[PDB]
Amino acid sequence: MVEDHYEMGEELGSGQFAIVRKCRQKGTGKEYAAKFIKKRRLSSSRRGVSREEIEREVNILREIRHPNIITLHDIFENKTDVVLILELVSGGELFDFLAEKESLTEDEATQFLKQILDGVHYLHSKRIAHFDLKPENIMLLDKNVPNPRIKLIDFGIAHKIEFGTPEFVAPEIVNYEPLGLEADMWSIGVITYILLSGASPFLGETKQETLTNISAVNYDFDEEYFSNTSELAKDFIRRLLVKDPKRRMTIAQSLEHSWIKAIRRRNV
Numbered sequence: 001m002v003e004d005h006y007e008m009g010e011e012l013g014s015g016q017f018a019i020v021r022k023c024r025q026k027g028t029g030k031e032y033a034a035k036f037i038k039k040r041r042l043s044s045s046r047r048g049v050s051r052e053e054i055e056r057e058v059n060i061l062r063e064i065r066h067p068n069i070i071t072l073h074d075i076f077e078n079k080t081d082v083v084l085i086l087e088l089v090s091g092g093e094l095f096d097f098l099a100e101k102e103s104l105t106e107d108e109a110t111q112f113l114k115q116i117l118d119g120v121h122y123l124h125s126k127r128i129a130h131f132d133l134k135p136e137n138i139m140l141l142d143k144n145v146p147n148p149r150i151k152l153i154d155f156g157i158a159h160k161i162e163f164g165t166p167e168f169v170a171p172e173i174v175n176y177e178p179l180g181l182e183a184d185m186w187s188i189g190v191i192t193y194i195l196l197s198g199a200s201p202f203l204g205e206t207k208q209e210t211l212t213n214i215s216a217v218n219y220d221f222d223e224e225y226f227s228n229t230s231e232l233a234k235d236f237i238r239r240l241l242v243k244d245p246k247r248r249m250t251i252a253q254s255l256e257h258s259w260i261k262a263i264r265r266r267n268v
């Protein structure tokens with residue numbers, strides 16, 4: 001059993017069918033995050049996570065080796081749960097960081113985005129789409145520094161290309177059209193808008209209104225939030241928030257973009 005080898009500690013987070021606890025590996029003293037995923041009782045049960053979601057997630061994490069993506073250390077399973085022993089990331093979600101900061105400067109935003117884009121470049125090079133990129137799925141190593149390091153998490157709907165969270169889904173998801181790596185690029189555009197403004201671009205009062213806004217690409221650079229934003233930043237976002245996935249910037253193009261490079265290019 002997992003608890004023979006890992007002493008479980010405080011609960012760090014929870015969702016509908018998962019709980020994550022801090023734990024300590026008894027043999028080494030090393031601390032990890034143990035994610036307990038509740039299995040379906042029966043193969044096609046309504047409640048619980050499909051065994052397919054679990055195995056697919058495990059297999060993707062085991063194949064990835066990148067500094068901006070969480071590592072999987074081990075796996076345990078009993079009758080009711082699959083327990084993933086994951087790298088512990090203790091600086092909280094980017095979501096909570098942003099909550100405290102309200103909105104980021106373009107320099108602060110690009111420092112995060114360089115890391116997010118590097119991790120996504122690694123995934124896309126392997127033809128893996130994450131499909132649930134959002135600030136809640138980006139963890140900080142340490143929140144009390146100017147340039148915090150991040151790791152992508154929650155690969156539960158990641159797929160190899162051969163419905164995530166309403167505010168972040170691309171139009172092709174909303175309209176049941178073919179999916180690819182481009183959906184992740186849309187989500188990066190949403191993240192970028194949020195980092196710079198503190199506002200979610202497509203959010204409506206209801207989920208239905210949010211989804212309607214996405215499909216119509218109904219957003220703006222409202223002067224409330226974007227009165228000081230550079231034309232480069234807007235170009236970056238505008239080239240991601242495009243309805244036709246074929247027209248959207250690719251991950252390589254996003255990394256080459258002058259906005260991302262601006263901070264590297266300048267001295268002061």
Ligand SMILES: CN1CCC2(CC1)NC(=O)c1c(c3ccc(Cl)c(Cl)c3n1C)[C@H]2C#N
Nearest residue numbers: 012013014015018020033086087089136153
């Ligand atoms: C998608 N959201 C965010 C991640 C989620 C599940 C719900 N929630 C967590 O609170 C959380 C999760 C984590 C997953 C991995 C690691 Cl290494 C950590 Cl520190 C995680 N934490 C803190 C997710 C779960 N369950």
